């Protein structure tokens, strides 16, 4: 089948980026290498924004989870890998890893099902 809507993550904390996006295959997954911003964050912000439009912060906000494990880093060095698996039922498994201490956390977020 195809996703119920354009799925993507929020980068730069506040912007909407697309990863899965509607009109794709439900059984999808991918691990990309993104960088962090603001030296000395010691924590990355991975927001799951599922939508396709200009100026987000209004579309379907999947979920928000806070990561940690990137001590004082002048950008570029931080290594965050994001994997997103979409299931038939309508779930998304997001995970961001940090390269500085070996910290990583994962969370499950229901795409759009409900009743």
């Amino acid at each position: 089948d195809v996703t119920p809507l354009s799925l993507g993550i929020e980068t730069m904390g506040g912007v909407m980026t697309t990863l899965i996006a509607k009109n794709t295959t439900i059984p999808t997954k991918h691990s990309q290498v993104f960088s962090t911003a603001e030296d000395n964050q010691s924590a990355v912000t991975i927001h799951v924004l599922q939508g396709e439009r200009k100026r987000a912060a209004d579309n379907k906000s999947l979920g928000q989870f806070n990561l940690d494990g990137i001590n004082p880093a002048p950008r570029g060095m931080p290594q965050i890998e994001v994997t997103f698996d979409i299931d038939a039922d309508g779930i998304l498994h997001v995970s961001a890893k940090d390269k500085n201490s070996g910290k990583e956390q994962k969370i499950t977020i229901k795409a759009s099902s409900g009743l």
Partner: peptide, 7 residues
């Protein structure tokens, strides 16, 4: 093209 800022 896309980084990752916190708040």
């Amino acid at each position: 093209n896309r980084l990752l800022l916190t708040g």
